């Protein structure tokens, strides 16, 4: 789907009262556009954290509020978190490495790190190790929405659910997701 389609869907969600949304972007031009539109939480996602950092600069210059950068190591997370205007990181890691990553980020004074993993099982391991914010995603979204609701009922807070169309976004909201991530490769 195109960026205009994603903007329309995000505005529709907001008009329904669904305000706890995060917009994912994959280029600096899109980051500027989403920020200029006034969306309050933007995920900048590039293959390399350096590309995300350049997108964060474009979003900040266009007025962004909260900017989350993707990373796959603790070192990359620290580089992003130290960048002006960046307010959080989405760290793709494994349960094996999460203890060390958590300790490293904490010692540096950073807490706003969202963990994601390759399987819902590994994400549950990350929560056990002390991950306080997680992102759940699945091929069909329905699996992710169900897992988030189960964890929420087990007392887990700050679950972000990735969604690929507006029906899934609404279901994730209704199930109590802390935030809903709108992924651009979806059907909007
Ligand atoms: Cl605009
Ligand atoms: Cl918003």
Author numbering: 1 to 188
Please give sentences taken from the publication describing this entry.
Finally, we attempted to design a TBF, a challenging protein topology that is of paramount importance in biology, as its structure is highly proficient in supporting enzymatic active sites, making it an ideal candidate for the design of enzymes with new catalytic functions. The TBF comprises eight parallel-paired β-strands, each separated by an α-helix, resulting in long-range interactions between the β-strands. The TBF has been a longstanding challenge in protein design, and it is only very recently that several studies have successfully designed this fold. Previous TBF design strategies imposed symmetry and parametric restraints at both the structural and sequence levels. With our pipeline, we could design TBFs without any constraints, allowing greater structural and sequence diversity and even asymmetry, which could potentially accommodate more complex enzymatic sites. We experimentally assessed 25 designs, five of which were monomeric, folded and highly thermostable in solution. To confirm the accuracy of our design, we solved a crystal structure of TBF_24 at 1.34 Å resolution. Our asymmetric design showed noticeable structural deviations from the initial symmetric template, with an overall backbone r.m.s.d.Cα (root mean square deviation computed over the Cα atoms of the backbone) of 2.06 Å. Comparison of the X-ray structure with the designed model showed the r.m.s.d.Cα and full-atom r.m.s.d.fa (root mean square deviation computed over all the atoms in the structure) were 0.80 Å and 2.12 Å, respectively. These structural comparisons demonstrate the remarkable accuracy of our design approach, further underlined by the almost identical side-chain placement in both the core and peripheral regions of the protein.
